[PDB]
Amino acid sequence: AGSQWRLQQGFAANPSGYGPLTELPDWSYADGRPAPPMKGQLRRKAQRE
Amino acid sequence: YRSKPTHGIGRYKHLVKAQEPKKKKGKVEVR
Amino acid sequence: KFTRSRIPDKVFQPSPEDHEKYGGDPQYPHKLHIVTRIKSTKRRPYWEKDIIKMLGLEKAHTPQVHKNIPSVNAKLKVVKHLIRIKPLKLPQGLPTEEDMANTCLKSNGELVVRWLLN
Amino acid sequence: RNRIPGRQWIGKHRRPRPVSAQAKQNMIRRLETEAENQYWLSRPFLTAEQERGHAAVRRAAAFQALKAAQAARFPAHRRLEEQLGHLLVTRKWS
Amino acid sequence: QEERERNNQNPWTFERIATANMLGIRKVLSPYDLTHKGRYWGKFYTPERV
RNA sequence: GAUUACCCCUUCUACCUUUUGCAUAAUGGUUUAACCAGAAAAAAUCUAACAAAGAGAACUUUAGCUAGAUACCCCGAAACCAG
RNA sequence: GCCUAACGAGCCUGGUGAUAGCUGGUUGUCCGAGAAAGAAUUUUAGUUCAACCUUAAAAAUACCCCAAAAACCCUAAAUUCCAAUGUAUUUUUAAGAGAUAGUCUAAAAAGGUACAGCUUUUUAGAAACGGAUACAACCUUGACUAGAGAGUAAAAUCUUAAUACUACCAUAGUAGGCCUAAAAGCAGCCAUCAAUUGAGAAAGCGUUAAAGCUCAACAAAUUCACCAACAUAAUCCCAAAAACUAAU
RNA sequence: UCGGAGUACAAAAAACCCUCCGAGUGAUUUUAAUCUAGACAAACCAGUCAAAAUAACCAUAACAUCACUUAUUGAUCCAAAAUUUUGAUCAACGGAACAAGUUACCCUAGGGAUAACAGCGCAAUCCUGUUCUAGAGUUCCUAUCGACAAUAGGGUUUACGACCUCGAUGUUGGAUCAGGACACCCAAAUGGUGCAACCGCUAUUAAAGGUUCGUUUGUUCAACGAUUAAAGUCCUACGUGAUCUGAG
């Protein structure tokens, strides 16, 4: 848990909130070309805008 | 109205006396 | 009979120590609110339900930005026990039309214009 | 051996359930949050006179958009392809 | 009863919570509890409550 | 729910009817097969024909008339009358 | 009473699919919205209207709502009305059925025993698959499907169970006056002076009345000392247990 | 049925076999017309106000008044009168044109929506202990008692409520068998006394065992005879009728 510590440090209370663990793409092709964007990430960037 | 600052502007019964009416049964010169 | 509660104006007079405790600005009030609902509209009167509905606070734990005008503050005072209110801070200022899609709102109450550059 | 008369949470005689130390802290945590709530509402940015009709064109436009969308309610168009597309039921391989 | 009320080291008191309607407590309290300040409950008067 | 493993473990107060509220110690059912209970088009809405007129007579008409489609249960008394 | 195993009036057939505001029953899947009672009634076991609600349609304003404003003897919580603002709701027209047998909690009252899980009204809330061990009504909760991910909300053992007060020491006027059968500090009345460095015409007990004991004042001497005690039920008590390894 | 005041404290509305007043018409003359904007009220039926305009009369005249003035009243149909108009304690007062008793000889459809028996809620009534001393006790408050009052608990009595059962929870007393509580009748230990002993009164502790046989009454209860260490109080669906009895 420890959500109070995370809020003190500036991070989100939930580790799934706008952290580097969520925004970054989880998979990519071996050759190196980027993978198609996630459905969740695109939706999350529409409510922020 | 109660909450308005102009409450009680029409008060008059405290200006004149009560003037007890001369009742038919209570008519007596109570001095 | 249970009726609405009238909040006396003496409650909303801040002490000189309040500004230092909560990090407020003694001279210039902040410009925008960030309102997050905490508790439930259930087991509460109907007039509190409508005020929550008309402020865009239907879903809990979702920040919503409102002005600091007295008209909005009049409604917030009714449901001030169901919401969490924090000021909106702008370290980089207002976003422009170029950086609309890169905005992110941190938990501490500041809006970062450029988020995860490159 | 010792019973609570009637239902144990309603009536003249109830259960003696006391308040716990955890419950006291929950009340205080909510009180501290609400103490901060009534400070940020204390000092508005604009006064009552300066907000007189500051945003009314947007409010008027929002209502006009509502009227326009609600007034467009009408049955949709009917085309020949929908009626003639039913004959494709018995399409065969000759 | 005034010195014990002036030097109270507890930030929250019945007078502050009830009048300001904190936590929506007015749904539980009686309209007379605004004046009684929590020192009176029915016909019972507890003098130790501040 | 599971589990290498049927139990052992953990989590769950039968089902309808009737009620403010039924695991209730309120009602009904041993179980199986067969049989057993929503029906009407005056005004209306939807679709179409023709339109100041419509209908294959008889009528309705200040956008109306003609046609179609959309509708309203089963079991049970003590009794009453005549032969 | 008896008249073919039921006679407050036989049996059979027909009228007969008698009629029941009363009881029971009402058969595939999935999806959308969704109501607790104001008024009349041989009426309160039911119906017909109003409100609310459903389906379709038209239109513009609906909620929140500041100042001003609403009674005369005293009078609380607060309502009505209304611009801004926040927000999308509301009205009208055309079709409609259900419901009209209510339970508790908080608040203002009434009847009662300032009794009821009691009863009659008004305002508000609820009817979790979580929490209060069990739990319709209390608290946390915007009820979708799949995952062997994560953060949080209400919330789990409640306080005190309290009171020792122990040295030393007593002699004058004087049975003060009055009172009474007798009233010697000590039924009552009245006064309350006075010897001795020290001791009240008496604080308590006692005597028929006296006598006598004790307490105030001598000296001696110096921990602290207001107050806080309250019986029992019937099948068998009822998680087990624990005063400190770091808790917003 | 209709009106006024409180319950209903400040716009409206708002109940009880709730607390208090009334109305079912009189007196008088100013004998109070016709026609129409707009509204209050309201389910409906009903009820209320009302400018302008016209006529009446000071020749550019409409509120009948007084009695808390608010209530002083009745729908259709139908009947009678000239056609104008009138007609009900239809008071069960939104009114069936005209109709009572009894059923333990009873029948049917239902209700635990609604009573009697039982449980449960509550403690007025009932029971048990303590706090407070005026007094009774020759003197002496508390050996034994204790008025006016305070406080806590038990759930045995009669009530109160109508919450589970009326497609059934069988109802007094005995017979048999007893389970349990302690607020103990006896048996054991002990404090106090207005306890010399004997016989007593009172309080604390203890529930393993025990608590009789007969006359009258259906009786539980009560009276009486004889006796016993004593012939306890109460709960258990006032235990126990798929074990019996049926006197009531």
Ligand SMILES: [K+]
């Ligand atoms: K109870």
Ligand SMILES: [K+]
């Ligand atoms: K039954």
Ligand SMILES: [K+]
């Ligand atoms: K039934």
Ligand SMILES: [K+]
């Ligand atoms: K059934």
Ligand SMILES: [K+]
């Ligand atoms: K009926």
Ligand SMILES: [K+]
């Ligand atoms: K004397």
Ligand SMILES: [K+]
């Ligand atoms: K009637």
Ligand SMILES: [K+]
């Ligand atoms: K009672």
Ligand SMILES: [K+]
């Ligand atoms: K029964």
Ligand SMILES: [K+]
């Ligand atoms: K015994």
Ligand SMILES: [Mg+2]
């Ligand atoms: Mg219970």
Ligand SMILES: [Mg+2]
């Ligand atoms: Mg409680």
Ligand SMILES: [Mg+2]
């Ligand atoms: Mg249940």
Ligand SMILES: [Mg+2]
């Ligand atoms: Mg019932």
Ligand SMILES: [Mg+2]
């Ligand atoms: Mg129902």
Ligand SMILES: [Mg+2]
């Ligand atoms: Mg059953």
